Amino acid sequence: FYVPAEPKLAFVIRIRGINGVSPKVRKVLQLLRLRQIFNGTFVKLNKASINMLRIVEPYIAWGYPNLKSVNELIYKRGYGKINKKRIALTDNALIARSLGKYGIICMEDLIHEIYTVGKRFKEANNFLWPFKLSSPRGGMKKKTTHFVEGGDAGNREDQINRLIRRMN
Amino acid sequence: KASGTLREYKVVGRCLPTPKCHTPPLYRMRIFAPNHVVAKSRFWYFVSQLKKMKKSSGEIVYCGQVFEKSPLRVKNFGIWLRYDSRSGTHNMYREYRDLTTAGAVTQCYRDMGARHRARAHSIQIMKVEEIAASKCRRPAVKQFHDSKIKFPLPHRVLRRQHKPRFTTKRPNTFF
Amino acid sequence: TNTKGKRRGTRYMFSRPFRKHGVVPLATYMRIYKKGDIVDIKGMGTVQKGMPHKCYHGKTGRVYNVTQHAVGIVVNKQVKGKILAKRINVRIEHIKHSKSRDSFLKRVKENDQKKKEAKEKGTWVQLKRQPAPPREAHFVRTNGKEPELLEPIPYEFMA
RNA sequence: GCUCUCGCAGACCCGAGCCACGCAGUUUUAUCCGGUAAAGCGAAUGAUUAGAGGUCUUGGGGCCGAAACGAUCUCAACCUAUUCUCAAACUUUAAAUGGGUAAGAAGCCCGGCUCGCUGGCGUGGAGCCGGGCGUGGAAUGCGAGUGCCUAGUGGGCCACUUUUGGUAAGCAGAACUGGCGCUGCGGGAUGAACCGAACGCCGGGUUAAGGCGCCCGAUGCCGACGCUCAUCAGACCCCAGAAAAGGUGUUGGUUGAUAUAGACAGCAGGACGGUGGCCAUGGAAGUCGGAAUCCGCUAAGGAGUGUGUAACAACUCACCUGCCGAAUCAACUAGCCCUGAAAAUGGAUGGCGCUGGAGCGUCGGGCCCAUACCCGGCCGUCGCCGGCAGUCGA
RNA sequence: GAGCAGAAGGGCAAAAGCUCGCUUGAUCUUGAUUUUCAGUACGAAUACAGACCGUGAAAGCGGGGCCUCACGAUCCUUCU
RNA sequence: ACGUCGCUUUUUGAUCCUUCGAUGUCGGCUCUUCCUAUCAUUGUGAAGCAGAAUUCACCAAGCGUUGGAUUGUUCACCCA
RNA sequence: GUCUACGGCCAUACCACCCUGAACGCGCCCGAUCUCGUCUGAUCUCGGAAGCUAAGCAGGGUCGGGCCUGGUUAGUACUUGGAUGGGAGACCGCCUGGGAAUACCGGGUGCUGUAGGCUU
């Protein structure tokens, strides 16, 4: 048997709203930069981040994005945090001004640094403003239960791509 | 666990290698699940009960859908299961006729829900075997072991009741 | 309602462990406490003089004063919506050196030596700790042995 | 308000190992803390059941021993090894969740100087003065620090879970988080708190929770599989009514038993002898009872299953046999349905109604719409302590 | 499984219990700190420092009671 | 019997949610309606139902359920 | 290989019974003049050196008790967080993570610091 490497990158979408959230879940969601429903972000997966995802499991749907998902998220909904502002990535100069010192000078560099986690994932990812996805077209199964029991919360391994196709 | 149409998954897992036993045994299970995510979850559920394994202390080295070997051959399936009722736990043997093992297990889940109000989290499939007609025991299955089987379709119900919704002619049932 | 007694609720907190009563071992009196080191306030109950209050049992602080038999400890206490640093005099029977600071000092010394050695040897080495990464890709041999089939057992009423 | 931090950038255009003072209702990695849950009582402290084995005893005593209970039989206590059952104010062991601390430049490593403290000692400790080390020594996110003046409030209530008193309470009292109060909106017919989601004025798209016979937007799908008939059916969190116990209604399941050496059920024959067995008695004969429970002939028969007599008699069973020709019997179990199930104005799955479902359980595909999400317009607030004195057609 | 004055809990064995011997640290002072806490007071307590002492061969130990309770502002009075 | 499961709100408690810028607080009399957990009457089933009488149960609230002494009485008790 | 003096951890070191102990040592042992204490030279204090390893002590033993450490019990009990899960309730199942304790069955039975001896 060939056991593939455990995935190093996750895409996390907040699926529940902001009403009646316990303080620890609230803090972890703020640390994940998911302060709104249907906000998505990339998370570099390790022990520290996974144990944070377990806390907010009822509130998020997350998984392992593929190359097409990363491409479409960056290209259609990619915005940069430039001078504390949400600026659309309409020119490579916007990426090169902020992340050029890390070798990232184009959308291709950004996509590479996200898909392969690389050395400057923290900088590139925090440069990315959190994605503001739409409501899922076609609906959700049940947002109040886990994915493995017929719902939407928690870790769906590679079905997060099916979710992404409908959410953007 | 919810449903859909179930598929069979061969899931092989093991404990993580430790400086006590470098090569731990590999365990294989047949899991009937809507998708491989649910299949992995149910595999961990079962091996935690059987062995002293966990998702954190172990890894899944394989998870692949098992295609039916003879999806064009009618056969009889016997299913041994255990389920939680409202007042106890029982073992059941049930029999179904199908072309696919996963289809028969889906039949079993629908039937347990219909007759015993048992949900999929209560049901726990533990054996599925293709049995012979001479080895079948349930009369509902056994009545189809007839080489010259023959029956009409007596009372055909009109199903296009709204195409047309209004009409002069009253429908016919005998065909 | 509740009394304000200084030892209310310490029935097990200040009691001795099982079969660990009697004379206090003398290495506890032989430990050396300097200013600036980190100590955990245990609070053993064999010695009643210099005993810490129950809110400091299980808390860790920094030594700022040394006397003949006690030390002064700056230990954080949370009072409603503020944390404030109390100074408490505790006899040395009720404290011990915190090993987290020992481990950190060991790691700092290791890092400094490794950096000095690495500049001389030429190549670069990693000094920061990292969280447990995702597991690598590997192969699992079967060794010509088929994996054992596992089947859930039937229910039987034990007793 | 103030004190700072990151930058601000190129006339247009065009980045040119390393990345802000610091902070955190979060995790990780180390390191401590605890005595709850659980567990335990052949471990201590308390509580408690039953047998067993013992050699001593102010145990009763125990039969023929008064005499040396010649003897050694029984019941106690006691001891030993076990055994059943427990603890908010018990405990060896002992979680989960949790609390503290650390994860560097105020650090690390070199030399030196001061001391009235300490002192075998150039000792110890502390302080001070120079010097050198940047791979900035986990993850993630965020700009921080600090002062003055200060209103209102100081009746709270509710929900998940933990939890005390009480039979309980829409009762009284705590813990934790969220909410209502202060809050509209979609859904729950209706509703302070439930579920979804929080709100500037709009257009388009899409959802949540919930639904899609008609009221009433949406299943007018040739939706899938079963279950269920109610002469009080059932019909969706909170939630707005039910239990034990029953059913030869039906549906699944478990376990056992009989049967082509003839089951089961029916109709049809036999159902004896010792013996009216013994003791009870007014009479108890197989049948009010107390023990026994055997034997022979047999295909088989109880010294009797029930009715019956004052007692007999007379029927009947279990037991065998004939006919009949192939599967059958029993005990459980749990789904729906029924019984249990009685209140006062006439009335409530919201109503109409619904039974090849508009009911129940398991599932599919479509579809409906919130002030939520996405795109766009417009208003305002906040931020960039953003740009413009270059009106510099030269 | 005793005792340590008392309620209970903790603690304690050439102890903190018992018996002796010598004693008056149950004394004179300034501050800091802990507990309740508003980080106010009182009470109680801890660690020191300066005196003067007690005891012991000494190391030391002692400024009340093994620890957790045993108590009291302004004004007035009284004494030193 | 020992036990155990319910229902009711014609008892009495428990609570304090509404009402203290007031909902007129006992009983009787008068009058209407409703409930059934049926006393009688209609139709039935069971008996330790021979008949007569009585008892238990079912469908069932259509119709009826009275005159008085004592007492403010509701209750109670007696006469008929 | 051991012991003595002083110890650190404070039973893997304790307890019961049995066996062995060479050499130093440690003891038991001999005595009360002095020192010092007693009802008692028993203990304590002092002065010794005839005898002895009988005792302490050391080492070993025991299908030994205990203690220590594993397995099992057991992914059981319990438990963080979730659901418009089930059930009249009592309670129960599942998802997401963590995860015990007996009984029962194994292994072990002091490590060591400083100073000083003995052991061909």
Ligand SMILES: [Mg+2]
């Ligand atoms: Mg909510």
Ligand SMILES: [Mg+2]
């Ligand atoms: Mg659509």
Ligand SMILES: [Mg+2]
């Ligand atoms: Mg919720």
Ligand SMILES: [Mg+2]
């Ligand atoms: Mg004292």
Ligand SMILES: [Mg+2]
């Ligand atoms: Mg407690």
Ligand SMILES: [Mg+2]
């Ligand atoms: Mg308990």
Ligand SMILES: [Mg+2]
């Ligand atoms: Mg006990």
Ligand SMILES: [Mg+2]
């Ligand atoms: Mg309350």
Ligand SMILES: [Mg+2]
């Ligand atoms: Mg108010």
Ligand SMILES: [Mg+2]
């Ligand atoms: Mg508010």
Ligand SMILES: [Mg+2]
């Ligand atoms: Mg609101």
Ligand SMILES: [Mg+2]
């Ligand atoms: Mg509404």
Ligand SMILES: [Mg+2]
């Ligand atoms: Mg309603």
Ligand SMILES: [Mg+2]
């Ligand atoms: Mg709209």
Ligand SMILES: [Mg+2]
């Ligand atoms: Mg509707």
Ligand SMILES: [Mg+2]
């Ligand atoms: Mg319509």
